[PDB]
Symmetry: D2
Subunit: 122 residues, 4 copies
């Protein structure tokens, strides 16, 4: 139980993370789609003392899409909530910004939504 | 990365102090002028440490969870954007602010907006 | 088969729409949540000649949350795709802007995602 | 609604011509300075026809499907925002641009951004 673990989203991407006691998120991300191969570094933050009223735990993290294999000149941030219990979720919305010229900045940022569970796809 | 590293302010009057590491790390503190926030908060993020040199911006993002040793808003913001270098350096962003909610209220958990940061120099 | 019909999202809201031959969307929306009661007018647009390569049909619509019962001083736009076939979907992301003072404009706009099907909840 | 009704231009140089009806309707045409677009496109939307009078903006939104009698981009944009009246009238928006995609490519279907419109007067 908790944020720390291996998570998978609806695309089949793999999010491996450790939640530090005082709010750090640290791990790796492997995307099933896009200009990406293998694992990328991620860092983020989470609320390390959530409310005690049934609310989720706010969090977010970033991946810059550069590793030893590829550089897509882009970065994604995920913002969302962890929802605990017997079917633990992380429900997110994300912003993927590509480096562009200023004139093309209007088309620099994709938006979407990812839902993560600890269930490995089969 | 001397470009990104420094002190920045946005249109709301918020203060972003950041260091860009050789490995692509962003670390620093954020102080918001608005919202359920006081003092400085930890931020962490990532940037493209080997960006295109064809006139394109440098992609980056960072997160603040709105808990510090004074206050906890039970929320987190992520900024996604690009650094545009030169003498009038800017970081242009869009952001998502998610509050912890009950499941019934999750539909109203996330605000969206845009911040432009100017480097103090 | 088609966009015209009665749709329901994951919240249990009801979206009743007619797709005009040349791109109009016209109908009503009833939200299961929020500062809303009964039906509200909606209008929007869709691509009335979609690609023939398996792509979805782009569309969007707006509701201003004023009717004879309530006025929330807000408006939502949904932007997304219709995906036809034997389990027809409308997959959307939305922006809900409330009227605010300029100083509070930073907190004026909620974002989320709704998926619609023609299956009435039970 | 004389306030909203008129001709507006955004920071890209796009042209928004709109009429606000007594019933809350928005109707008009949009011409984009950028993207897979030429000439005018139909728009339709809605606004709050009885807004607060406490200093708040007037909520509104509209849609353009990027098909006209010259071109079809297989895409649609919605703008969600508020009208701020007075002598320096503005419509401040965020937008979502969804392109039709295959199901496999749906993750990359939607762009987000922000436009500010100034009324020509
Ligand atoms: O193509 C790129 O610029 C890099 C890869 C982006 C993959 C995106 S991030 C949001 C979405 N969720 C995923 O797991 N993968 C895609
Ligand atoms: O109210 C909260 O939940 C915490 C503070 C949020 C402040 C937001 S983050 C996006 C925007 N940019 C800022 O500098 N401040 C606001
Ligand atoms: O509370 C308001 O300001 C008016 C009602 C908003 C309801 C929102 S629109 C997006 C989401 N999808 C729905 O079916 N209902 C909520
Ligand atoms: O490229 C397309 O799919 C059609 C044209 C899109 C133009 C976009 S809509 C949001 C932004 N604001 C504008 O005035 N133009 C761009």
């Amino acid at each position: 139980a908790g944020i720390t673990g291996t998570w998978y989203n609806q695309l089949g991407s793999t999010f491996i993370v450790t939640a530090g006691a005082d709010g750090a998120l640290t791990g790796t991300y492997e995307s099933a789609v896009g200009n990406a191969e293998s694992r990328y570094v991620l860092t983020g933050r989470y609320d390390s003392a959530p409310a005690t009223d049934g609310s989720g735990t706010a969090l977010g993290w970033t991946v810059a899409w550069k590793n030893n294999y590829r550089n897509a000149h882009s970065a994604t941030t995920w913002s969302g909530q962890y929802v605990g219990g017997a079917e633990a979720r992380i429900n997110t919305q994300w912003l993927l910004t590509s480096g562009t010229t200023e004139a093309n900045a209007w088309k620099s940022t994709l938006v979407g939504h990812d839902t993560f569970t600890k269930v490995k796809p089969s």
